[PDB]
Design an enzyme around this catalytic site. Structure first.
Site, short mmCIF file in Angstrom:
data_model
loop_
_atom_site.label_atom_id
_atom_site.label_comp_id
_atom_site.label_asym_id
_atom_site.label_seq_id
_atom_site.Cartn_x
_atom_site.Cartn_y
_atom_site.Cartn_z
N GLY D 68 0.86 -1.18 0.00
CA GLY D 68 0.00 0.00 0.00
C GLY D 68 0.89 1.22 0.00
O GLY D 68 1.80 1.33 -0.83
N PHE D 69 0.56 2.24 0.83
CA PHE D 69 1.21 3.54 0.69
C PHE D 69 2.54 3.51 1.52
O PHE D 69 2.51 3.17 2.70
CB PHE D 69 0.24 4.61 1.25
CG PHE D 69 0.78 6.00 1.21
CD1 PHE D 69 1.31 6.51 0.04
CD2 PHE D 69 0.56 6.83 2.29
CE1 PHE D 69 1.78 7.84 0.01
CE2 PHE D 69 1.01 8.19 2.31
CZ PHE D 69 1.59 8.69 1.18
N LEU D 70 3.65 3.77 0.83
CA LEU D 70 5.05 3.77 1.42
C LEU D 70 5.21 2.66 2.48
O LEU D 70 5.62 2.95 3.65
CB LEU D 70 5.19 5.13 2.07
CG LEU D 70 5.24 6.34 1.07
CD1 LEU D 70 5.15 7.70 1.90
CD2 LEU D 70 6.54 6.28 0.32
N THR D 87 0.00 0.36 4.57
CA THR D 87 -1.10 1.28 4.91
C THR D 87 -2.04 1.22 3.73
O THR D 87 -1.61 1.43 2.53
CB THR D 87 -0.56 2.68 5.07
OG1 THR D 87 0.28 2.74 6.25
CG2 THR D 87 -1.67 3.69 5.19
#
Ligand code: HEC
Ligand code: HEC
Ligand code: HEC
Ligand code: HEC
Ligand SMILES: [Ca+2]
Ligand SMILES: [Ca+2]
Ligand code: NA
Ligand code: NA
Ligand code: NA
Ligand code: NA
Lengths: 376, 131, 354, 376, 124, 355
Positions: D68-70, D87
């Site tokens: 997901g995000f970073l 995330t």
């Protein structure tokens, strides 16, 4: 000839020199108008995608909308809202699937509705505009389902609620004509009228077969809901036109977008959104190029423009880029929009002269679908 | 590389878009993300649905039915993207249509497209598309 | 010699002296005019066959002998799937081991024992000549060698080209000698793109040389009991047919209710269908697979009765990964499949298609 | 030097000629080995991301894992599992946030644990490997939190459960030395040793200050858990080394990766993972190039190799590409991995000669982080 | 275009990576996805946190404090990406660090990065 | 004349003859030795001030007059935010309108009416000369004119450089005359990157010419009642100070509980803090903002009392968008902020910083 970024630098320097204060804030997009254009990037089947909202007159991105996996966008013709049907998963591309419709305010881009569609009923396919469709009154959204069989889901946007699935025959695409009626194209070559205003199984009636089994109708016909005109090219550029404006299908004279000589020389339509239709002008625009018969999804470098009533060619434009999709604004002196998936750029042309006016680049990974409102 | 030119199959490199079995592939070649010509990569789910094309193999001059299958449940690989459409028909002839995400039957109801395999299932051709 | 062996099997195959009361031969139930299946109407229609005693009925449908010679001997493959063998539950390893079983089965040909078979063989001067020429002098005086030799001859006969001629329209089309009609080609395309090819094709991939439209595996597809056949069989309302688990030596509970994937060759002329003959029409056999895919109320209904199909005889081990394919067969695809499956009819049975 | 695709066509053609049948199925990755390398693609802050598992000997992608995000990737040194802290959001990049840890089997790549992190506690930052870290026994994952204040979260991987947040001083990064202990770097120029329990205030001890306020220590130090060696470059290519092998910090002499003449002529390290450290050879590798002092995140084209004990330069390799990140395999005759964010390509080099051996391209949108297991 | 050369500010085009206020920008310029130099695009959420750089303005010879702000709650715009690091210090001096997603304070708890604005907040 | 008006204001400012019992001048409560705030102890410490009657306490803390002359006249801006004005609730439009009010307020200077203020002005030959020279012969015989003139003079005096000298360390550093310490510099950088600058800076963007570390807007930051001050003021346990909604003509309930952002100049020497003088120490005033960002238990405890900060006097209309910033101030950054806020002290009050 000063660019947008240059003019913005000069305004910012002027504000600084003058001591002008302004509050950093969230901008509103300018009111929807005839020259707003939406470009959807299905991003070559990525799990998340983007839509770019663009002012076609300035050639400027005015906003964006995020989407899930292969969403279907819709734009209300009167500019009152935009919406999409989208699909997300609980762990990026795996886990529980949720399909849903969001409706967005077209100036703040804020979601004003988020309507879950039970049992993940959407058809996941490279984006076809008329696989999800608004009724003319804007109150209902219809989307196509392929599995386990062709079906059409009815979403009440006023009540913000999924309603029901309609069982249909072996048919595809959804062209709504009234608050309670839409047409589809059947495998057997007929169109089906589906009337669903009463509850229970819809009333479904077929036209006569209008094309033979070896004539192939592309996945991206143009449909003008305000004209009731369905403009449907085949692989050879023969164009079927069906008038739905009386509520029943009337088949108009077929026209050929290419001459016998050009066809014998290898000219064929090809790309993604191959065809556009201007309602006020009653004019058909078709992406064409010389290609082998099975290269029908490759980019094309030419557009032919023809009178819908007569079939007369009005123009043939060398677009100057590899174009996959076209569309037009529905105003006077329309713009001809020419999107290149490979360049990720929307080229904005004068529809009359074919000349390129401006372009908007960096539109995602693999942008393919252009949508405009018919506000006139 | 003229994209509009008649596609010319080869039988020497399966990671290239002109490999003869890829004549109606739409997506990404699975051999480039840890699968192989006819197997899915680790972590993905092999769909049971399929799309067919009759693909001419320039080596032996025979046309084989390639029943493509998707490997699903992962974001698209991004490696070895290819779109070919030999004999590809529109969506209302879905047996020969390739924009459809053919992930039906994949384990865990996986429906996201990662890549496609190209196995042979027969030797035959079609009325609408024969050599 | 190979010819002579098979020719001796041809004689045995139609000889009712291998049945206790001399009323029945292999050919009575596997009638060559009906693709080696049973045309006779008994108490449960054509679902099950009547034995030499004129009253006993079996509990499973008489299968064709055509192409049965292509099936591998019974074995477990390296993925732990059992394949091959003979009978619907694979309890015979191969055709030789199967041939003796109807002879001694009291519900079929009903001979009391091998000695009684050997005695009937010794009574025929032609069998003394024919068996001695192939197996040696006095073979018929030794009941074990006689019965084994009779089985070997019958298995040899069933391995001749007459049982597996590969002359159906499908074979001709694959040889490039003619073309499918559009409906038949659609049907073939449906067959190879929908789930049918997961079970009804010899190989996973590549080109089969002598395709018989079965992978020889065992699957529980969740069929209901055929009530009238189960009544006729006399096995009792309490009986459950466990399929492959009934093979001696198979103990794995995951095999319960699985049956051998039948070859679809000649399917159009060998109704009724499935291991218990429960569906009379080929179209109903196809529609049954829609129970696992369609959400339409009609998919739950057997069109031959107008009532639900019925609960699976054996609830467990259903081949759900293959059957729950997410795509239903609309009536057009059903029509196309029927058209396709008709092309798997051997040339000599084309007049039965009508 | 037949290519992978060429060999495979040859083998498929031979199976077809032989009539060889095989069952289409899901492959297993080959056993994890010293030459397996993982590349994570933070995709220039896109909401979803990819990791590529690669066999560095063959130069072949052997699998992928979505994130997901970073997300922060970690790889167990012994090859037993990989994991990440990731995330996601309920509507792509908006809506409810869920932070979670997933542990994956390194052959099937199936998640064997999915552990929610309460209250969305991850630090979202461009990816720093030592912002999430395994303890040496593999049983605990530790992740950094910045908001509302620096804290470290403790995740029990054996019990598959989030344990607790530890409050720490104004410190950054996480270098675990024991099942219950890790070090961080503080703004004041010390390290903090943090020793923690299931409950109760952790024991936090600072080391001496070891650098001045105007030496800037990069965000991507190298840390060999098995050696206890923390190799920490500054912007000028001065390298601090700290030996944590005793369980407390011992400050080793500083070395300079660049000569006084090279620094006078503009040489500085630069990129993302600018430094690698080979444990068995005790060797340090540093991405360097001629650059202005504030172009410290740009790619570099050279790698210097130095003896960690003496500072003696052993090699200076011309990489021949714009490299942002380096790492090495931890076996004999190691590979030097050189990842170019702009080319989305991992170049795989002989670490002794510097020669490029092979390369793996199309590694997502902006691949930045290379991770290997130290299996020896 | 030599990426390793000293950054050279200009004050003539805000969508370019060498625009003077973008001296420590990391991400994407908001003016390119429907925001403006100092305003976020519609549908995004303006963070309250900030990071600061002293950026030289070649128009007036003065260095100004630019307190960057992220516009959050959307996937990254993908338009006009830029990464500059003038004065940028590592994460332990977070007031000058630019790899951190500075979305703190944004409405609806938005924390995904879309683009960055470059307002002035003082003289440096 | 600009000078003469201010010089008249200078005399009136220190003149206790403008209070009923002649005990109190503006300078009594706005003591120039204390940045124009009140050093005197009353029943609530230094939280609120005692009037000329020697008994009456106000309910709000006496603010500095330093830099008050930089505040815009009261107005509503287009984005619907009220700004500017004088008093913590902005009920005076500007300095002139504010100046007469202490004179007539019975809890402050307690003059009965304008005529009584005029009679005191007339008694003084120096006021007869000074007023008549600026406003005309007879001005002091007309109570309305005499009073309006006195307010004009006072407002002019407070607009002089004496009240707004811009000679703090901050001002010097911004002129390049000297540099901050690393700790003051850190403090400035915290102030400008954390949420403080969202309210305590003149502008949203750009550079202010005469920064006074307020945006002149009105916010409810959710302060509790100061109980000892509220008891001293006598307004009653059920009293609510509605801040800006108390300004006549403001009817909007969203304004309840909002007070004018104070300039932070001289904040280090003008304790105690907030509109009701509730916190004695500057560090405590800074710590208060951690109640919106820190999840630690101490974040909710007033370090001066060891007890919770308390329920807000006005629970509604809190500036939560600004206050709930997602980042707390650790002790290093509170130290840095204290250091930085001390640099906003005018040069002549630097000696007060030690104490
Ligand atoms: C009374 C009817 C009848 C007679 C006579 C009979 N069969 Fe059968 N045949 C069956 C039935 C019923 C089955 C399937 C039974 C089962 O699966 O348990 C069967 C199955 C077989 C099969 C297995 C084929 C498959 O696909 O599994 C072979 C081979 C066979 N018969 C050969 C013979 C031969 C040879 C003879 C003469 C020795 C013979 N049959 C006599 C009814 C009969
Ligand atoms: C999961 C494996 C599997 C799948 C998929 C499958 N079948 Fe079958 N099929 C069987 C088995 C096993 C039988 C015998 C079942 C029994 O009688 O217990 C059978 C029986 C049949 C029969 C009756 C044949 C006879 O001689 O009695 C026909 C017709 C049939 N299948 C056609 C189809 C078609 C058409 C499809 C695709 C719509 C299909 N099958 C899908 C395994 C499969
Ligand atoms: C008894 C003490 C007392 C005396 C005497 C007094 N003041 Fe004040 N001053 C206050 C208090 C208390 C406030 C805040 C009251 C409020 O906000 O309602 C105040 C506020 C003000 C303010 C508004 C400043 C701001 O930032 O809002 C000005 C201006 C002012 N005083 C000037 C005067 C002048 C001029 C005189 C003499 C004519 C005067 N004061 C006499 C106590 C006093
Ligand atoms: C949302 C607006 C807002 C924010 C953000 C804000 N303040 Fe304030 N501040 C105020 C207002 C309003 C007051 C007066 C409150 C009252 O007394 O009712 C005030 C009062 C103060 C005071 C007391 C001054 C005096 O004369 O009594 C100090 C000190 C202070 N602020 C420092 C800070 C610091 C340092 C920060 C950043 C950590 C900060 N403020 C953030 C609005 C803000
Ligand atoms: Ca049968
Ligand atoms: Ca005070
Ligand atoms: Na029956
Ligand atoms: Na058994
Ligand atoms: Na008090
Ligand atoms: Na009021």
């Amino acid at each position: 000839q000063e660019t947008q970024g240059q003019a913005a630098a000069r305004a910012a320097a002027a504000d600084l020199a003058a001591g002008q204060d302004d509050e950093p804030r969230i901008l509103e997009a300018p009111a929807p108008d005839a020259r707003r254009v939406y470009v959807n990037d299905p991003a070559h089947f990525a799990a998340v995608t983007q839509q770019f909202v663009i002012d076609g007159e300035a050639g400027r991105v005015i906003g964006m909308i995020d989407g899930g996996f292969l969403p279907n966008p819709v734009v209300a013709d009167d500019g009152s809202f935009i919406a999409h049907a989208s699909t997300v998963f609980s762990r990026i591309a795996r886990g529980e699937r949720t399909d849903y419709v969001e409706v967005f305010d077209p100036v703040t881009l804020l979601p004003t509705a988020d309507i879950e569609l039970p049992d993940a009923p959407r058809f996941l396919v490279g984006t076809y505009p008329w696989m999800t469709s608004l009724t003319p009154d804007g109150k209902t959204l219809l989307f196509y389902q392929f599995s386990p069989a062709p079906a059409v889901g009815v979403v009440d946007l006023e009540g913000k609620a999924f309603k029901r699935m309609l069982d249909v025959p072996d048919c595809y695409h959804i062209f709504p004509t009234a608050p309670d009626t839409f047409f589809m194209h059947c495998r057997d070559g007929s169109l089906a009228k589906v009337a669903f205003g009463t509850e229970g199984t819809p009333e479904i009636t077929h036209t006569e077969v209008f094309h033979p089994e070896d004539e192939f109708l592309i996945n991206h016909p143009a449909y003008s809901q305000k004209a009731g005109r369905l403009v449907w090219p085949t692989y050879t550029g023969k164009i079927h036109q069906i008038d739905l404006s009386s509520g029943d299908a009337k088949f108009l004279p077929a026209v050929e977008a290419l001459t016998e000589a050009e066809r014998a020389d290898g000219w064929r339509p090809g790309g993604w959104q191959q065809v556009a239709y201007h309602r006020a002008l009653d004019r058909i625009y078709l992406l064409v190029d010389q290609r082998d018969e099975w290269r029908h999804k490759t980019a094309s470098r030419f557009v032919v423009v023809l009178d819908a009533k007569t079939g007369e060619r009005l123009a043939k434009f060398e677009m100057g880029h590899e174009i996959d999709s076209i569309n037009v604004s529905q105003d006077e002196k329309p713009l001809l929009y020419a999107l290149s998936t490979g360049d990720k750029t929307l080229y904005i042309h004068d529809a009359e002269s074919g000349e390129e006016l401006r372009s908007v680049n960096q539109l995602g990974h693999g942008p393919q679908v252009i949508t405009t409102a018919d506000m006139g | 590389t003229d994209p509009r030119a008649k596609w010319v199959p080869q039988d020497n490199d399966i990671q290239a878009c002109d490999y003869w079995r890829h004549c109606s592939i739409d997506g990404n070649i699975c051999d480039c993300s840890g699968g192989s010509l006819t197997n899915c990569p680790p972590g993905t789910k092999l769909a049971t649905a399929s799309w067919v094309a009759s693909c001419y193999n320039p080596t032996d001059g025979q046309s084989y039915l390639i029943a493509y299958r998707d490997c699903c449940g992962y974001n698209v690989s991004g490696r070895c993207p290819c779109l070919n459409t030999e004999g590809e028909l529109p969506v209302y002839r879905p047996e020969f249509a390739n924009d459809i995400i053919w992930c039906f039957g994949a384990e865990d109801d996986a429906m996201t497209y990662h890549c496609t395999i190209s196995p042979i299932v027969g030797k035959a051709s079609h009325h609408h598309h024969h050599h | 010699a190979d010819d002579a062996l098979a020719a001796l099997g041809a004689q045995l195959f139609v000889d009712p002296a291998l049945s206790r009361n001399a009323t029945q031969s292999c050919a009575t139930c596997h009638d060559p005019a009906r693709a080696f299946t049973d045309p006779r109407e008994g108490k449960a229609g054509l679902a099950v066959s009547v034995g030499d005693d004129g009253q006993s009925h079996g509990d499973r449908n008489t299968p064709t002998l055509g192409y049965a010679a292509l099936v591998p001997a019974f074995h477990r493959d390296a993925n732990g799937k059992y394949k091959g063998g003979q009978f619907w539950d694979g309890r015979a390893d191969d055709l030789k081991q199967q041939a003796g079983q109807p002879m001694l089965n009291p519900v079929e040909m009903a001979m009391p024992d091998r000695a009684a078979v050997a005695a009937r063989l010794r009574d025929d001067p032609a069998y003394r000549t024919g068996f001695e020429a192939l197996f040696g002098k006095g073979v018929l005086d030794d009941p074990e060698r006689a019965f084994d030799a009779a089985a070997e001859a019958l298995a040899a006969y069933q391995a001749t080209g007459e049982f597996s001629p590969f002359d159906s329209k499908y074979d001709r089309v694959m040889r490039g000698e003619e073309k499918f009609t559009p409906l038949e080609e659609f049907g073939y395309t449906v067959f190879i793109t929908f789930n049918c090819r997961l079970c009804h094709m010899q190989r996973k991939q590549g080109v089969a040389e002598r395709e018989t439209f079965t992978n020889f595996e065992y699957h529980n597809i969740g069929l209901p009991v055929n009530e009238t056949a189960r009544e006729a069989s006399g096995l009792g309302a309490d009986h459950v047919d466990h399929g492959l688990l009934a093979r001696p030596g198979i103990e794995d509970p995951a095999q319960s209710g699985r049956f051998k994937v039948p070859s679809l060759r000649n399917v159009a002329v060998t109704g009724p269908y499935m291991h218990n003959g429960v569906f009379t029409d080929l179209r109903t056999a196809i529609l049954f697979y829609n129970k696992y895919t369609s959400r339409r109320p009609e998919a739950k209904i057997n069109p031959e009765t107008g009532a639900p199909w019925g609960e699976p005889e054996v609830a467990r081990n259903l081949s759900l990964a293959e059957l729950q394919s997410g795509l239903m067969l609309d009536d057009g695809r059903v029509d196309a499949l029927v058209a396709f499956l008709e092309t798997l009819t051997d040339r000599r049975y084309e007049p039965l298609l009508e």
